[PDB]
């Protein structure tokens, strides 16, 4: 019921901001803040009003709210929006990140600003629609239309048409690397539906009847690779992640909040929801390749993070290290491991968003991007580097932050299922420390005479500090007290694991 409205407010707000662009220019900032407030209101209403602590073994079909509507009846394509417990965590996270995106874009007036915000709400609404998606075509359409408006963001707002490096390399690799694999998973969807159409005799694009379709061995394996390729180019996996640092280092850091904190979520959401239950034996065969790619991703991202000299590419290469833990979590037979991935995933968004906001904040203070050029700014800034120290501290497994409990319950479940690949995996924490300290010492520890421009520094406004203070206190409560959201996700995680166990 609430789901059609909850995916449509982003699109309605873009229309109204661009409508009132003719009326005024200070309107869309204040319009956008209220519209994202309504998005979190409906999302938090579903958290509180709904039975978040529901039955742990109520089957694979279980939803607090559900919407159905005929869209293309010839294939049974329907607007099958349906919200689960873990999907509701995703919706509340993106509503909060949308508030941060529209708050960081405050006091940013240009030649056109309504165009920026209709695009801003369009891309955030696309991610919400992926998170509420049970029909395969609706899932794919939303997956691919959140991908078009970021291209305009990197192009027309990466820099205003002055340098050609903001389109022809950064934005173009971002677009092609995702869309080729999106078309791969579309033909994977179609091969799965056609083998189901031979089995039963109805053209259906719905998840519940495609869940248990009879397929011979050696056939569903190729479709599982087809799903995983599109789910491995969106979250950074080892062979195909070259788009991520270019995308984050060129887009404005509000666009980078969208590009890191929430676009990385949807691929592991799809690995939990759409790839694991549909292909149980194929995923059981593919598991060790996934573990090898996971350990390679953690070690690889940390080394490339240590070796880099700038900051946006630095945090962009932390992200590929973080997601390796999540991939190994998903491809195991443990309930605790999956519940560790969820808390690690929410904390991943919350620990990347603050760093990107602050890295963009530091650049507009000093007008210099290279990290090794500055140094010793602690005597000049009064609140930026202290808050930045805790966010760099929250990146690695420091307890009292959500990242520690996240990565570390994965390791418990991972050692429960398989010893040797887990005992390799744990060493990324040592490597997490070295790139964390490298960031901290190269940027803030030292003498302010490392740069001439490090001798005249501005002040920090109240609202940026307010939205940084909220994230640090929110992230500490998730580290100390993670029970409420684990009780929320228990049943959804449990039936996925029980199906992955029982179907093999």
């Amino acid at each position: 019921m609430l789901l059609p409205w909850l995916i449509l407010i982003p699109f309605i707000g873009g229309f109204l901001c661009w409508q009132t662009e003719r009326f005024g220019v200070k309107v869309p900032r204040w319009i956008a803040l209220i519209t994202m407030g309504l998005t979190l209101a409906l999302s938090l209403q579903l958290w509180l009003q709904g039975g978040y602590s529901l039955t742990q073994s109520a089957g694979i079909p279980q939803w607090q709210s559900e919407f159905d509507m005929p869209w293309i009846p010839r294939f049974g394509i329907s607007i099958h929006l349906a919200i689960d417990g873990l999907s509701l965590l995703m919706v509340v996270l993106t509503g909060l990140l949308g508030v941060l995106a529209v708050l960081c874009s405050w006091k940013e007036i240009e030649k056109y600003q309504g165009f920026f915000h209709l695009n801003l709400m369009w891309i955030l609404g696309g991610v919400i629609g992926v998170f509420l998606a049970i029909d395969m075509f609706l899932f794919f359409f939303f997956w691919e239309m959140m991908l078009v408006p970021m291209y305009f963001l990197i192009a027309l707002w990466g820099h205003k048409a002055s340098d050609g490096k903001t389109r022809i390399t950064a934005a173009t690799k971002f677009f092609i690397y995702t869309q080729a694999s999106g078309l791969v998973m579309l033909i994977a969807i179609l091969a799965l539906v056609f083998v189901h159409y031979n089995a039963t005799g109805v053209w259906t694009f719905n998840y519940e009847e495609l869940l248990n379709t009879p397929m011979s061995s050696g056939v569903e394996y190729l479709l599982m690779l087809g799903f995983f390729i599109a789910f491995a180019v969106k979250m950074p996996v080892v062979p195909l992640h070259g788009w991520l640092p270019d995308a984050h280092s060129q887009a404005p850091t509000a666009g980078s909040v969208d590009l890191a904190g929430i676009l990385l979520k949807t691929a592991a959401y799809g690995l939990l929801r759409f790839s694991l239950p549909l292909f149980p034996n194929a995923s059981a065969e593919f598991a060790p390749i996934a573990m090898w790619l996971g350990v390679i991703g953690i070690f690889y991202g940390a080394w490339m993070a240590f070796a880099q000299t700038d900051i946006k590419r630095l945090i962009a290469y932390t992200s590929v290290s973080h997601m390796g833990f999540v991939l190994i979590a998903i491809y195991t037979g443990s309930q605790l491991a999956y519940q560790g991935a969820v808390i690690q995933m929410i904390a991943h968004g919350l620990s990347a968003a603050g760093l990107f906001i602050l890295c963009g904040q530091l650049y507009e203070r000093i007008h210099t991007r290279d990290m090794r050029m500055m140094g010793g700014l602690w005597s000049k800034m009064k609140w930026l580097p202290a808050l930045s120290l805790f966010f760099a501290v929250a990146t690695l497994g420091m307890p009292g932050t959500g990242n520690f409990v996240g990565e570390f319950m994965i390791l418990f479940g991972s050692f429960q299922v398989v010893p040797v690949i887990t005992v390799i995996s744990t060493f990324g924490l040592v490597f997490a420390s070295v790139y964390s300290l490298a960031m901290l010492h190269r940027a803030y520890f030292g003498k302010a005479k490392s740069q001439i421009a490090s001798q005249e520094l501005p002040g920090m406004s109240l609202r940026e500090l307010f939205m940084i203070l909220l994230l640090v206190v929110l992230l500490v409560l998730l580290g100390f007290y993670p029970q409420p959201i684990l009780d929320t996700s228990h049943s959804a995680i449990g039936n996925i694991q029980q199906w992955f166990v029982n179907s093999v």
């Binding site: 195909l240 309930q335 602690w378 009292g400 924490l429 029970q483």
Partner: protein, 612 residues
Amino acid sequence: MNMLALTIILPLIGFVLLAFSRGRWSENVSAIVGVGSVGLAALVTAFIGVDFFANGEQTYSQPLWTWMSVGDFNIGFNLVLDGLSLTMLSVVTGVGFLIHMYASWYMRGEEGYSRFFAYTNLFIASMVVLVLADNLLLMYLGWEGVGLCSYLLIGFYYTDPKNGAAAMKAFVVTRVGDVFLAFALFILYNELGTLNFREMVELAPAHFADGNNMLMWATLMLLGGAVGKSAQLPLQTWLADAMAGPTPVSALIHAATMVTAGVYLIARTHGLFLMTPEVLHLVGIVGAVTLLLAGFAALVQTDIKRVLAYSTMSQIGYMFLALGVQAWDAAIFHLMTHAFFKALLFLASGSVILACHHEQNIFKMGGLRKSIPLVYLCFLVGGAALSALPLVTAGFFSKDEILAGAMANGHINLMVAGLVGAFMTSLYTFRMIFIVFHGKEQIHAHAVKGVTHSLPLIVLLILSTFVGALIVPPLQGVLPQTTELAHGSMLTLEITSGVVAVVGILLAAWLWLGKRTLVTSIANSAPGRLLSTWWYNAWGFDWLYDKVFVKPFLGIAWLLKRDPLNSMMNIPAVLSRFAGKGLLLSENGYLRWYVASMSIGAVVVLALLMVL
């Protein structure tokens, strides 16, 4: 009595105030609130200590709230106040109170004031969490809680980057130990299910009827965690560099707060180490080889802070031996004495280096008895206890008891290790004060008189002596494995340690009382400098631990200065663009070749149809 969290909340809450009053408060109000947080902590500790005496040494547990709970993974904020944990709380809430009360006077006159009293409270709060935790998880929060605080206090002065760069090697090394510590934590949950210490104690033998081979991996890798956080061979790197910070943080890190976490983990899991005897004796094996390393490096360099540091390394490993010889209560007795002397010994040195006015040398000062004898009596009391002197010292009973236990274990190499350690402690006992305080004062050390530090000096003077040795720590509430006692040979071992201490003290005084030309000759002899350079490298261990992984890490970072896999999956675009440019060049514009294209399409279509 329902007041355990007040030993954590009251410090921790005070940190939050000083973390946001970033220098806007004045000197006095900031000083009072910083000391009063730790003062309330000691008072609440004393109330529960005297009530623990009223409890009849009965443990009191308090669960605040469950942390996380999955149906097979139950972790809760459980606090256990038993005899072992009460003693480890007593050291912290007294020593941190005394060290921090000195910092109320030492810190004033310079900036970074509210900042320093913010991070000290967090440092103390993390150490209290570690020793009161009942679950290995919550205790893990303690380990890297105090590690991050050591980073924030070693690199406290952010202006010059030497001390600003010295902290991260400690941070990297302590997280290697924490990875080693969490490895055993995974294995214990896989093998025995519950992480509570007592439920673990009488669940371990029930689950272990069949297979035992994997428990040595758990316990050996658990041991690798304990050793690293304080000081030991496999990971002894950072304690020389930790001296680059201010004097009060060196006392807190090195004396009794952070370095007393690796002792608490071995002691708390003593039954768990009794499940496997060889991993228990291996603690003493590594302890016996580190007393041979940690001693004479105090003599080598001319830095007073490096002197006090290699002595702490020697003493902590001396404990590991004491725990490896199944003398548990005696080791904590050694800790109860050890906290008192080391903190004062470190602190008094700071007062005089305030008076030194940027000297930082041991060979250019002398005749300091006439400057101020208060610091003279401070080093003196500390030296006597360390050397195992029988004259009204506090710690000599602890050394006598652990060597009695060690010879009751019956390991002649361990008594040889103990004998050479007693001789080696007496060597660097008085050599420092003889080379520094005796001679001629060509640079005057201006002494500073003030009651604000004199009163804690008198308190630390009356506490570090044998008057403080009469306070028996609570050890009857845990009922550990009983420290065995020997009679008849107790007097023989007592006089043997006294003779060893006296010979070492007389040799240092004979080094002093000579011309020192032979000392200069052995400080100029080429094999002497070879050993000095060899133990500058400290068995090459910092040398080995840098050149084994560091420049490979920098080399792979220099190979990762540009991202390889982003480039190597761009070759589809490279091939497509170059192949597209070739196809554009294939077009001509001359219409004869257009018709030739039509004929050559007809030729290939007919050929492709005739092969079908």
